[PDB]
Amino acid sequence: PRTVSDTKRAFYAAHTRPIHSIYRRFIEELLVEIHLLRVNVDFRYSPLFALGVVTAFDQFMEGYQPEGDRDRIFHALCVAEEMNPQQLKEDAASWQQYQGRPLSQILDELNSGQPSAPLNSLNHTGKYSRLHAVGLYAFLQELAGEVTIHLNETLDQLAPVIPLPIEKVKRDLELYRSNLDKINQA
Ligand SMILES: [Hg+2]
């Protein structure tokens, strides 16, 4: 039964190389965030969570040098959170099968009640995190037809179909996109 302090300690003990100030707050924030999730007893890991973490990390770590340490940092962060970085990476990778598929097909699979894995992750209940929203956003970007042009319209199509809390998703992705647009234009 670990603590935020214990987690920060495990991360810094595993990765004793310098981390630049530009990147260090994002990493600390993500350490705390995942910690708080993973000790909620209703949180249940799934590939949607994996895709979210990989996506958010990859986005804020763009440009990081020395680039070789990006993987050491990912490893240290996973082990600090009592996760297996190989499992998170496999799970993220498992979504690649849907590249180029149309939204109609995905909705058909979800409405059948027997969606393939990891798409079935969208049904599974448990404590919701903004990282689930990030994961969902990464998955939708893979589909044919630029479905995130009108992201909220796409999310309204999913609302009757999946128990993921779509109003929370819509707001989390508005904040995610706002934050990234600011960071990118500074
Ligand atoms: Hg990780």
Author numbering: 4 to 189
What does the paper say about this structure?
Here we show that Psb29 in Synechocystis 6803, like THF1 in Arabidopsis, is important for normal accumulation of the FtsH heterocomplex involved in PSII repair. To gain further insights into Psb29, we have determined the crystal structure of Psb29 encoded by Thermosynechococcus elongatus, a thermophilic cyanobacterium widely used to study structural aspects of PSII assembly and repair. Each Psb29 subunit consists of 9 alpha helices. A search using PDBeFOLD found no known structures with greater than 70% similarity, indicating that the specific fold is novel.
